[PDB]
Design a protein around this ligand. Sequence first.
Ligand SMILES: [Zn+2]
Ligand SMILES: [Zn+2]
Length: 79
Amino acid sequence: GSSGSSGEKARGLGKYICQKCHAIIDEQPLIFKNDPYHPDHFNCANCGKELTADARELKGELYCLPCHDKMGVSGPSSG
Ligand SMILES: [Zn+2]
Ligand SMILES: [Zn+2]
C-alpha cells in the first residue's frame, strides 16, 4: 500500500482568525501585509477613527475609505 497513512477528511469551515488577537473575525477580515486582522484594532491616520475591513493602506499606514477618497482628488490630471 501507500507508505504511511491515507484516509482523512475535514470541513471545519469557520472564519478568518485575527493574526493580532487570535479571535474569529465574524465581520470582513482586514487584510494587512498578507495576514488577517480586525478593522477595529487600527484607526485612520488623518481623522483618527475606527478603520474598516476595506481600509486602504498608505505607505504602511491605514486610512478609512472616507479619508482615502479625499486623497485621490485633483484638477488637471495628466497620466
Ligand atoms: Zn483582532
Ligand atoms: Zn479617516
